């Protein structure tokens, strides 16, 4: 059904596909990323996505309370998901703040990243059109680093709080506040524009990318796997957790979304179409990103792995460079950053609404007493703004990288996806879950879903976790910056805040229940009505 796609496809795709996947793929050397990416997509991604929507429809209890009807012991999965959402909402909006700053900087006769006659540029700047004719730096890269970001020399040096970036964060949070409070969302005739425009802009950037002199050398780097050397655990964890991040699984937002749907519909085809569409747009936009990078390699006369940032700044370096190469660059820069703001804001609205309704159910006697709901929304937005304010400082990039690596990705998604699949397959029961799916949608999942939940997803999550611990290498920003041990510990604390929820809730519910230990366990394993 055309409408069934059009309504939700443009909101399910978000900044993950356009921004995180290109930067993670570039960080891991291009073609080697795609092998563990497609292994996780079909081994785990589509099966765990189908699993979470089924839980949502089956329980109709939201992202947290759903586990009471499946396995009371593992209710901590809901709290882990809700704190993953809480951490994601703090850092994800910083990308919209950067996009907003870029959009206001676009209102010029000449784009500021197109040249470096400007005051913020180092004497090492050389225009890319002349560079190939040393330690030279590109005007776009040091624009990113010094005007927008003001990159401090380390996380130990927070520096000054950037007032412009703080006001951009305030602007986006005000927009989120009013849209969530008033319930504004694309449902009128504007949905067609909101869905079509991102794909149109992506296709325009694709055609600009593929036609630039060097696009083929960038598409070689993007598709040729380094199978003989690249199989470190970092590429396995990155590629695996990118699938879980892009599908918004392990967040409990999928269960919440499914809780508002009637359990009498063909879930399977809709989930398989939405997931294959999302992974398709990610993979396709990869061609544009890497053909822009491969053109930059041929213009500047350096290797494709050295043209740009092995980090979040990849998109803010590549796409501005692309729109610099187009007729009337101001128009395309403005359109690109409006597209980015729309695509990020829709996802942010979904995630904040999911967080709000998840947290309201934990105290409806005070969190839902009429306008107390608006008060709670304002409190959540203010707290998230004050938390994001730490990343507006000159050293905010390192905090942002730590948050992206640890707080809502990596081992925590592997942990949540492993416990979901393990509980449903083994503790609750694969036969029970398949019978329930029969009752709802009319047919059993079949062997692929059954064995993906029973073996493949647990084996992939445990293999990636153990390989990460056995062959541990620490996080870095870009290619060379090394985090201090205290910042690594902070990132691991961010991750453990989500991970520890399951053991903590297990021991709490064991404490809360009377009777002998085995009777407690039997009581807390059996579902409630």
């Amino acid at each position: 059904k055309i409408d069934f796609v059009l309504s939700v496809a443009g909101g399910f795709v978000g900044l993950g596909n356009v921004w995180r996947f290109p930067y993670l793929c570039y960080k891991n050397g291009g073609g080697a990323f795609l092998i563990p990416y497609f292994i996780f997509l079909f081994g785990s991604g589509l099966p765990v996505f189908f699993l979470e929507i089924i839980i949502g429809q089956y329980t109709s209890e939201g992202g947290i309370t759903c586990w009471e009807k499946i396995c009371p012991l593992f209710s901590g999965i809901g709290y882990a998901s809700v704190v993953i959402v809480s951490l994601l909402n703090v850092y994800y909006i910083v990308i919209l703040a950067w996009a907003t700053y870029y959009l206001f900087q676009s209102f010029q006769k000449e784009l500021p990243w197109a040249h470096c006659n400007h005051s913020w540029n180092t004497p090492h700047c050389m225009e890319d059109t002349m560079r190939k004719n040393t330690n030279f730096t590109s005007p776009v890269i040091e624009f990113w680093e010094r005007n927008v970001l003001s990159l401090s020399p380390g996380i130990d040096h927070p520096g000054s709080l950037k007032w412009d970036l703080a006001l951009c964060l305030l602007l986006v949070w005000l927009v989120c506040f009013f849209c969530i409070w008033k319930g504004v969302r694309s449902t009128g005739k504007v949905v067609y524009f909101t869905a079509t425009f991102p794909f149109a802009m992506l296709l325009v950037l694709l055609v600009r990318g593929l036609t630039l002199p060097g696009a083929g050398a960038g598409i070689k780097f993007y598709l040729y796997p380094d199978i003989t050397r690249l199989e470190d655990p970092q590429v396995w964890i990155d590629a695996g957790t990118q699938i879980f991040f892009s599908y918004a699984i392990c967040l409990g937002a999928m269960t919440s979304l499914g809780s508002y749907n009637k359990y009498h519909n063909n879930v399977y085809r809709d989930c398989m179409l939405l997931g294959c569409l999302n992974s398709g747009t990610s993979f396709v936009s990869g061609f544009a990103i890497f053909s822009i990078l491969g053109f930059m390699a041929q213009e500047q006369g350096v290797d494709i792995a050295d043209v740009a940032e092995s980090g979040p700044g990849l998109a803010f370096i590549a796409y501005p460079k692309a729109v610099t190469m187009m007729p009337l660059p101001t128009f395309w820069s403005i359109l690109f950053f409006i597209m980015l703001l729309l695509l990020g804001l829709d996802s942010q609205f979904v995630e904040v609404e999911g967080q709000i309704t998840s947290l309201v159910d934990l105290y409806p006697s005070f969190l839902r007493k009429g306008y107390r709901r608006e008060i709670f929304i304002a409190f959540v937005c203010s707290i998230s703004y004050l938390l994001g304010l730490t990343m507006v400082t000159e050293g905010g990039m390192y905090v942002f990288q730590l948050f992206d690596y640890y707080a809502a990705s990596g081992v925590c998604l592997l942990w949540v996806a492993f416990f979901e699949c393990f509980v449903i397959a083994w503790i609750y029961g694969g036969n029970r879950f398949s019978e329930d799916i029969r009752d709802m949608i009319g047919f059993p999942p079949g062997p692929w879903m059954k064995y993906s939940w029973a073996v493949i997803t647990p084996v992939l999550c445990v293999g990636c976790f153990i390989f990460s611990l056995v062959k541990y290498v620490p996080l870095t920003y870009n290619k060379t910056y090394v985090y201090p041990n205290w910042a690594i510990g902070l990132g691991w604390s961010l991750a453990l805040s989500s991970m520890l929820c399951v053991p903590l809730v297990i021991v709490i519910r064991l404490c809360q229940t009377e009777g002998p230990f085995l009777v407690r366990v039997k009581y807390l394993l059996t579902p409630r009505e």
Partner: antibody, heavy 118, light 107 residues
Framework: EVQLVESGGGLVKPGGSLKLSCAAS????????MSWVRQSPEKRLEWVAE????????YYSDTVTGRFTISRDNARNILHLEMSSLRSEDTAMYYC????????????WGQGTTLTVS | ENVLTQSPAIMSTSPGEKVTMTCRAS???????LHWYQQKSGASPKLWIY???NLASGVPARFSGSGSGTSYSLTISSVEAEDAATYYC?????????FGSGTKLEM
Amino acid sequence: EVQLVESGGGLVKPGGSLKLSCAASGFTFSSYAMSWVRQSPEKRLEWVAEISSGGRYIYYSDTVTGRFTISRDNARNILHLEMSSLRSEDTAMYYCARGEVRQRGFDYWGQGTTLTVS
Amino acid sequence: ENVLTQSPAIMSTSPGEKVTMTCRASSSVGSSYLHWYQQKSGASPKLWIYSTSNLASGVPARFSGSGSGTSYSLTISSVEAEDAATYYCQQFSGYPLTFGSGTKLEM
């Protein structure tokens, strides 16, 4: 997926009770939902009851909802139907049908047993 | 209960002629949840068409099915002696399950 064989049909007085049986073979009976379908002497097909593959979900038609009790023995691959109070209108031939996929329907039908009340 | 009705209660037909049998529903039935069954005289019914077009394992290709919403039909390109049987439409979209009144080919 080969064979189904009903048993237990016969003659009982109105208001009596009877228990039908349906044996299964050639497939994993525990993995398939089973249903009873009823054909009146007027040849009209009427659905009676459905039991899920694990027996957790059970449905009845409104005309038998209070009087009939479907059950299954996954360990023996035999399906059962229990009737408490047979009215005059219940006389018919009963077929057990394999109905695991609602989008595909009743793949296989047993030979059936005639039930008479008078 | 979604009552299903079939119009041509009896069809005396000469061999080789095309035949179409209509099925009508009191309520909207999903296309995936309507099926057709054949029943030869003196034998148990057998699945014939499912999901409104998908022919069963043993049904000859001469049979076909079409429909949507509250109207459904089964067609035969050319009837024959082997096709003389009673055909029932059935909805699987919601309980209680209901079968159509059934139509018998008479020649």
